[PDB]
Design a protein around this ligand. Structure first.
Ligand SMILES: CC(=O)N[C@@H]1[C@@H](O[C@@H]2O[C@H](CO)[C@H](O)[C@H](O)[C@H]2O)[C@@H](O)[C@@H](CO)O[C@@H]1O
Ligand SMILES: CC(=O)N[C@@H]1[C@@H](O[C@@H]2O[C@H](CO)[C@H](O)[C@H](O)[C@H]2O)[C@@H](O)[C@@H](CO)O[C@@H]1O
Ligand SMILES: CC(=O)N[C@@H]1[C@@H](O[C@@H]2O[C@H](CO)[C@H](O)[C@H](O)[C@H]2O)[C@@H](O)[C@@H](CO)O[C@@H]1O
Ligand SMILES: CC(=O)N[C@@H]1[C@@H](O[C@@H]2O[C@H](CO)[C@H](O)[C@H](O)[C@H]2O)[C@@H](O)[C@@H](CO)O[C@H]1O
Lengths: 15, 133, 17, 133, 133, 133, 15, 15
């Protein structure tokens, strides 16, 4: 709740 | 003084500062979190010594700063940060230094403090904070 | 620029400018 | 394969990867920028050898990736990333690997890639990217 | 085609689009959330008519899109978006249109789609998405 | 007082407030920018009358607020925001109200104020600001 | 949830 | 400027 977050996109490759 | 800029990190794990009950804040060092691992920041030190060291160890991830407040005033002719108080969701650490002068406070409803920048000569001259989600 | 940005509030203390 | 997650940083200064013109992408390592300082990321290696190494040295701060593209395909029974191409505002790096399979691409109109996570066995199984302003 | 740019909002409440089983996507209209209230976006319409309308109503702030996928390909000499599929944390909506051409997909591990921009002539030429936390 | 929360927008175009030189800040209304279009915010009105109107029209996009300061004090036993000052990169608007009590200030080195929330009874009880890049 | 977040500072005034 | 920004990914479709 104290850790900063970031936008993450993906995976691409093996599902 | 000498300007410093730590930049932005993932969070804050520990804050190490020093002060003098007759003057103002002196040294300032932060142990940041960097993607789940501790990152020891540079220790921004005063041009003089003789300060009282204080260690603020947070129960990172669950404990985080919700408000930073303090006082700015003159010491020997220079406007500096004389006192600092950190309030987290668990406890209030502070006040360290001299609670005299003009107050300031930054309460946070949503978001996190993820970094610091400022300047320190004999004492902490000024500072700013990086905020992020 | 290739440097990531962040919101920065302050400065509190001595006038910088 | 073995998963890795570098986390998020301030930018990217260099990408070190390896490939085999007959199979797919192998090793993957990144030198990120951490508030002005190069941050040497862990070298995520393939379980095997025989790859050709490539060093993509970007002119950080002025140069940054604007598009990542590649091909995913079947190699020895596994779906892996066979090719990768990085396009910046200054040059186009690649294609590295085998341009065979199904292409994919992630163009960015605004924002920056600030980190990578994924998995590597014999080859690069898959990967994701952290994005930020 | 005629370019459009809705800009960024707080979230997505409903998506209205149309398609023709023999060509591609034609019209596109989004009902966004704007600070807890619905905001009806412009209806970006094709230069022609004769499309089948579809309404995708999400149970906004519990339901949200996690992946957008589809196919791009030629139709009458133009590269356009022929099919779109929306996968949320609750259900999969689609595919709408013709699943022919080159597949593409934008999976999101963390973050939200909060706006769209693109261009529509006879059909949806291309589109981009605004992402935020 | 009655709580209000406008939410987050793209920027600020104009601020309409009212004050009384003997008491505190009264009405508060904002015309925000919403992806290029003026968004007329709800007028958050004091429970009482007798205030003096002030219209702060900014040269949106080039002009934007860099610092908000003011005073909080006691009025009839109620602690409220007695004065407000807005400093932009072009000019200083204010002080409006009574510059008496405990000062507060929020200078911004990087970022933008994109929304307001708070509470107004006879006077502005308190307020918070949304910040974004 | 599907509601976008933004940093919010305050408040300032009474509590 | 006084205009808020946000990450934008794409275009997919015609270059
Ligand atoms: C030479 C030096 O660094 N002196 C320190 C002071 O710094 C000066 O501070 C003023 C403001 O008070 C202004 O910014 C000048 O440009 C700067 O050189 C100051 O840091 C004091 C208090 O800590 O210590 C030294 O005197
Ligand atoms: C034991 C190991 O990691 N082997 C690697 C392969 O991994 C397997 O991958 C599949 C998907 O393709 C699935 O995740 C299995 O559980 C996993 O063991 C794979 O990484 C290949 C290609 O790089 O190399 C090894 O064979
Ligand atoms: C009925 C009402 O809203 N009255 C307003 C005051 O509100 C009270 O305020 C205190 C704090 O100062 C506390 O929040 C009480 O629960 C609340 O009812 C206050 O808003 C004043 C000043 O603006 O105006 C009315 O009297
Ligand atoms: C005149 C017009 O708008 N025609 C539409 C097509 O637009 C052209 O599109 C190409 C790319 O495919 C390029 O941008 C060119 O400059 C445009 O004029 C295209 O939108 C087509 C498919 O929807 O419909 C035509 O009406």
């Amino acid at each position: 709740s104290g850790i900063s977050q970031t936008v993450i996109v993906g995976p691409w490759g093996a599902k | 003084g000498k300007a410093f800029d730590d930049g932005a990190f993932t969070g804050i794990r520990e804050i190490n500062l020093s002060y003098n009950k007759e003057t103002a804040i002196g040294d300032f060092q932060v142990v940041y979190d960097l993607n789940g691992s501790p990152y020891v920041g540079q220790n921004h030190k005063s041009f003089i010594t003789g300060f009282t060291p204080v260690k603020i160890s947070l129960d990172f991830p669950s404990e985080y700063i919700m408000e930073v407040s303090g006082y700015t005033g003159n010491v020997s002719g220079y406007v500096v940060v004389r006192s600092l108080t950190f309030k987290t969701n668990k406890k209030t650490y502070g006040p360290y230094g001299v609670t005299s002068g003009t107050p300031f406070n930054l309460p946070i409803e949503n978001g996190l403090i993820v970094g610091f920048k400022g300047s320190i000569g004999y004492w902490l001259d000024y500072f700013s904070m990086y905020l992020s989600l």
